[PDB]
Design a protein around this ligand. Structure first.
Ligand SMILES: [Cl-]
Ligand code: NA
Ligand SMILES: [Zn+2]
Ligand SMILES: [Zn+2]
Ligand SMILES: [Zn+2]
Ligand SMILES: [Zn+2]
Length: 327
């Protein structure tokens, strides 16, 4: 079964300067490998994926080998080429069929939704429990259909930026809060969400205070929105519900170069945030956690990326594997 404290790492299906790591050479400290990325061509709906090294059959066998060792391998849909546009049923079906074909071909354990294309609320799409924007409605439907095809053990994750989730605290329009209807719409099938707590600037917590990315207070404040639920757009009558704590992870850059505009946090400071979130132990931050005792089943950390971590001699993976193994 899938563990209670996870390290989820993005795996580059490309060389961005940090090199390509073949699947069998990925550190065993990662519990889940998010293969980056499934992409689309002209129809912006049929997802395609070809491994950057070797044959398709060899990649399929590498995945089988990792799965035999208890690891999960997930296909991430996103990046610049992971444009998925679902304006109608036809596009939705192409997306569903192509994803199912890839899962079957390579033996992926599930999918990671790392999309931004078309993810913005139409004017007048104001109810997160009943969205009307076709892109959003169709994406929710497709995710539920794909998930159903594989059953309750299908691994579904999502990695939106903060504007699309916690940004909903300030406004519910355009991009702000636009993942909220997606999250709500698939919450019964969502294994975990790892919001990207980086390339974000600052975030307003439920206490009304602004916190800077890369600080312990920010990590706690942003995660707490999902652990506790929050009022959308300054309206106490429009409450976004809490997720299960086992559905909440925090996404972090593995090193500063992985997120140039900011978001990297030192292990010393992040362990303070983790101790507060998980164990209810405060550290002298300004942010007061919603729940006195913490959220022991908080699911863990995601990182951009396995490749960046390796170029930084595994600082991130080593520090947090040790931290979680010690609980
Ligand atoms: Cl809990
Ligand atoms: Na290839
Ligand atoms: Zn279902
Ligand atoms: Zn099938
Ligand atoms: Zn973005
Ligand atoms: Zn409460």
């Amino acid at each position: 079964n899938l563990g209670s404290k996870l390290l989820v790492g993005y795996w580059h299906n490309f060389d961005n300067g940090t090199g390509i790591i073949k699947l069998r050479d990925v550190s065993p400290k990662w519990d889940v490998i998010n293969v980056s990325f499934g992409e689309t061509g002209g129809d912006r709906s049929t997802v395609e994926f070809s491994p950057v090294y070797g044959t398709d059959a060899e990649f399929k066998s590498d995945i089988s080998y990792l799965k035999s060792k208890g690891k999960k391998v997930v296909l991430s849909i996103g990046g610049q080429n992971g444009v998925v546009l679902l304006p109608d049923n036809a596009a939705k079906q192409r997306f569903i069929n192509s994803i199912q074909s890839l899962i079957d071909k390579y033996g992926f354990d599930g999918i990671d939704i790392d999309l931004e294309s078309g993810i913005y609320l139409n004017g007048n799409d104001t109810n997160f429990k009943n969205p009307t924007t076709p892109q959003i409605v169709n994406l929710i439907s497709a995710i539920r259909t794909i998930s159903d095809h594989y059953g309750p053990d299908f691994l579904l994750s999502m990695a939106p930026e903060t504007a699309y989730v916690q940004g909903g605290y300030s406004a519910y329009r355009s991009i702000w809060g636009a993942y909220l209807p997606i999250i709500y719409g698939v919450k019964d099938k969502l294994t975990y969400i790892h919001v990207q707590h980086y390339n974000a600037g600052s975030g307003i917590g439920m206490d009304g205070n602004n916190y800077n990315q890369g600080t312990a207070d920010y990590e706690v404040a942003m995660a707490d929105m999902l652990l506790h639920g929050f009022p959308i757009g300054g309206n106490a009558n429009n409450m976004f519900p809490a997720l299960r704590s086992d559905q909440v992870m925090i996404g972090l850059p593995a090193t500063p170069a992985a997120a140039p505009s900011g978001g990297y946090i030192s292990p010393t400071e992040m362990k303070k945030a983790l101790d507060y979130i998980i164990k209810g132990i405060p550290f002298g931050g300004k942010y007061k956690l919603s729940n006195e005792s913490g959220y022991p089943a908080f699911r863990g950390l995601m990182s951009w990326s396995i490749n960046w971590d390796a170029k930084n001699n595994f600082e991130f993976s080593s520090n947090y594997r040790t931290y979680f193994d010690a609980i």
